[PDB]
């Protein structure tokens, strides 16, 4: 098992005409494998949809992925933006 | 490191024969020297003065030379042409 593989490759043809959005060298980086898309970094380790207690076939279409991400209320953020200045 | 030695520069004979310094020994900002200007403790700033990198480039390394009730003062003239 080696560590020093390249995994980043550049085609010699300069196609930098419509390429202002991708990841450039500063040429285009062409990796060996695809990317990883992660939804949220912080998990909600409580929240009994995930905790599964052992008391008492049901579905629940929860609104989006933002239930499991620990977001603060706008009341405190306004209380903190008043604490800003 | 990064320290200049205390000796081993005697660029004086070149200034004896520099023909702009008014020395009668030999014949054949806006300041010149930073003796009123600081340099913010970077020694490269002394190379901007023209009479100082003249002594760093045209300089030499010397070895140090090593060695009555009423004075009678007699002025002695020395006039020798030499090459």
């Amino acid at each position: 098992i080696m560590i020093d593989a390249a995994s980043s490759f550049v085609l010699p043809i300069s196609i930098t005409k419509n390429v202002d959005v991708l990841q450039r060298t500063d040429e285009i980086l062409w990796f060996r494998g695809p990317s990883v898309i992660v939804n949220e970094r912080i998990i909600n380790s409580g929240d009994p949809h995930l905790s599964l207690p052992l008391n008492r076939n049901e579905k629940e279409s929860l609104p989006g992925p933002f239930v499991l991400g620990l977001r603060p209320s706008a009341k405190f953020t306004a209380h903190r933006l008043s604490m800003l200045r | 490191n990064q320290l200049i030695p205390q000796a081993y520069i005697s660029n004086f004979h070149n200034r004896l024969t520099n023909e702009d310094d008014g020395i009668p020994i030999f014949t054949m900002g806006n300041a010149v020297l930073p003796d009123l200007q600081d340099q913010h403790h970077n020694p490269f700033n002394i190379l901007r003065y023209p009479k100082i990198r003249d002594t760093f480039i045209n300089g030499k390394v010397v070895s140090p030379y090593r060695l009555s009730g009423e004075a009678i003062m007699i002025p002695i003239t020395l006039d020798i042409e030499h090459m």
């Binding site: 980043s8 490759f9 085609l11 043809i13 | 990064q2 300089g59």
Partner: peptide, 29 residues
């Protein structure tokens, strides 16, 4: 386009870790 072997970009791990960013230390004329 499938005969277009690309240039590998080598990292050279010692260059990845601690390379900084000599006459300017005036002791060498």
């Amino acid at each position: 386009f499938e005969t277009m072997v690309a240039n590998p970009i080598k990292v050279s791990r010692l260059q990845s870790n601690g390379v900084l960013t000599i006459h300017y230390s005036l002791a060498n004329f």
